[PDB]
């Protein structure tokens, strides 16, 4: 009974309806590719490894995990039906960080920064 991580969110589901839309293509090519290069992106580039980071309570509190590594794979795999489903995953990722941690925490400042930028970039999407 060592701590383990849960399986990650799925990034493939052949039975799920999906599309490659202009807006989804933009979410990959512009928005995620951008965010992924930010100085504060690194904690969010993969599922939280609660074993490595010694956070045995993380997955007790966070029951809908999400990260930008899972997002990237989903966009690459054309997993989504529309851009809104993708934007929802970004919001879950941010909101998870705010739930688990506290205002003022370094990890919270990082999320807040990425989130301001994500919002700036999706303010105008393709048609």
């Amino acid at each position: 009974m060592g701590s383990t991580n849960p399986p990650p969110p799925e990034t493939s589901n052949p039975n799920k309806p999906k599309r490659q839309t202009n807006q989804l293509q933009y979410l990959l090519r512009v928005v995620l590719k951008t965010l992924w290069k930010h100085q504060f992106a690194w904690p969010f580039q993969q599922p939280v490894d609660a074993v490595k980071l010694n956070l045995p309570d993380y997955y007790k509190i966070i029951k809908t995990p999400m990260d930008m590594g899972t997002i990237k794979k989903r966009l690459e795999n054309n997993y989504y039906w529309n851009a809104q489903e993708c934007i929802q995953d970004f919001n879950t990722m941010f909101t998870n960080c705010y739930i688990y941690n506290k205002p003022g925490d370094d990890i919270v400042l990082m999320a807040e920064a990425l989130e301001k930028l994500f919002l700036q970039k999706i303010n105008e999407l393709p048609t």
């Binding site: 993380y58 941690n101 925490d105």
Partner: peptide, 7 residues
């Protein structure tokens, strides 16, 4: 657990 020291 926490990700950092309490500020």
């Amino acid at each position: 657990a926490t990700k950092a020291a309490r500020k």
